[PDB]
C-alpha cells in the first residue's frame, strides 16, 4: 500500500510530467487501443486513428483525473467517487481493462522519463495505478 516513500515517489514523478500530463494521457490511450484491440469496444463513438482529437481531448480528461488522485492520494475513494459511478454502472468497464491501461500508462512514463523511471519509482507508480484501478471498480468491488 502507499507508504510515505511511495507517496513521495509518485508526487516526484508526477511533478516531472508537468505540462505534458495531457499529451501523455493521449499517448497512453493510443497505446492501449493498438496493443489491446478489445478495449476499443468501449469507444464506438470515437475516431481511434492516430491524430484523433477525440483521443487527444480524452487524453487530457484522463490526465486531469490522475492529477486529482495524486493531489488527494490519502483520500482517493472520495475524490474519484464520481468517476467510479461512471466506469462501474454507466459503462460497465471490465476490470481487466484497468490493468491494460495502467500498463500502457507505465510504458509511456518509461518512454518519457529515462532519468526518473528507476525501479523503486516504477514499483511505486505501479502501486498507485492499482489503487486508482481498485477505486474505479469499487461499485463492483
Amino acid at each position: 500500500v502507499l507508504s510515505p516513500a511511495d507517496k513521495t515517489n509518485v508526487k516526484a514523478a508526477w511533478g516531472k510530467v508537468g505540462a505534458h500530463a495531457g499529451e501523455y494521457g493521449a499517448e497512453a490511450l493510443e497505446r492501449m487501443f493498438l496493443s489491446f484491440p478489445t478495449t476499443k469496444t468501449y469507444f464506438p463513438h470515437f475516431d481511434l486513428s492516430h491524430g484523433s482529437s477525440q483521443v487527444k481531448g480524452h487524453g487530457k480528461k484522463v490526465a486531469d483525473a490522475l492529477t486529482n488522485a495524486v493531489a488527494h492520494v490519502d483520500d482517493m475513494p472520495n475524490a474519484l467517487s464520481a468517476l467510479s459511478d461512471l466506469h462501474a454502472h454507466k459503462l460497465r468497464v471490465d476490470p481487466v481493462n484497468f490493468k491494460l491501461l495502467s500498463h500502457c500508462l507505465l510504458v509511456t512514463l518509461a518512454a518519457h522519463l529515462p532519468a526518473e523511471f528507476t525501479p523503486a519509482v516504477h514499483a511505486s507508480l505501479d502501486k498507485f495505478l492499482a489503487s486508482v484501478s481498485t477505486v474505479l471498480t469499487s461499485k463492483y468491488r
Binding site: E27, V107, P119, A120
Partner: protein
C-alpha cells in the same frame, strides 16, 4: 502469432539494437521489485532486501541473460513456440509450479524495460507488435498446464 511483415520489422529491427548483457537483469530485477511475491522464486539468489540490493545482485544479472536468450530464441520460432518452449514449460509448470499469470507479468515488465531504453522509438505500433510476441511466449510457457 501471425504478425504482419510491417510488425515483423518493427520487432527485429529494435531487438537489433538491444543490450543482451543488460536488459535481461533490468527485466528480472524489476519483476522482483514490483511484484515481490515473485521473490519467493529466487531466495537462493542472495540479497533482495531492497531495490539497490536486487538490481546489483549478480545472480539476478546472470539469470536475466538466459531469460532474454529464451525470448530471442522464441522471437526466432514464432510459428512454433510450443516446441521451442516445451523444455522450459515443463520446468516452470511441473517442477517450480509457477502460476502462468507471472509469465504475463514478466513480458509486461519486459516491454516497460524496452520503452525505458528506446524512448521515442518505442512507438505505439512497435509496442503493439511486442505485446503480441510477449503474449505468445507466456502462452508457449504456460502450455503444460492444459
Amino acid at each position: 502469432v501471425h504478425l504482419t511483415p510491417e510488425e515483423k520489422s518493427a520487432v527485429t529491427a529494435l531487438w537489433g539494437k538491444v543490450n543482451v548483457d543488460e536488459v535481461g537483469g533490468e527485466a528480472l530485477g524489476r519483476l522482483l521489485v514490483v511484484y515481490p511475491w515473485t521473490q519467493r522464486f529466487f531466495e537462493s539468489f542472495g540479497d533482495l532486501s531492497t531495490p539497490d540490493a536486487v538490481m546489483g545482485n549478480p545472480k539476478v544479472k546472470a539469470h536475466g541473460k538466459k531469460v532474454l536468450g529464451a525470448f530471442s530464441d522464441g522471437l526466432a520460432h514464432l510459428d512454433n513456440l510450443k516446441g521451442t518452449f516445451a523444455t522450459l514449460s515443463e520446468l516452470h509448470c511441473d517442477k517450480l509450479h509457477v502460476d502462468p499469470e507471472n509469465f504475463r507479468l514478466l513480458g509486461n515488465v519486459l516491454v516497460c524495460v524496452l520503452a525505458h531504453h528506446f524512448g521515442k522509438e518505442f512507438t505505439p505500433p512497435v509496442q503493439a507488435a511486442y505485446q503480441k510476441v510477449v503474449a505468445g511466449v507466456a502462452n508457449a510457457l504456460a502450455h503444460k498446464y492444459h
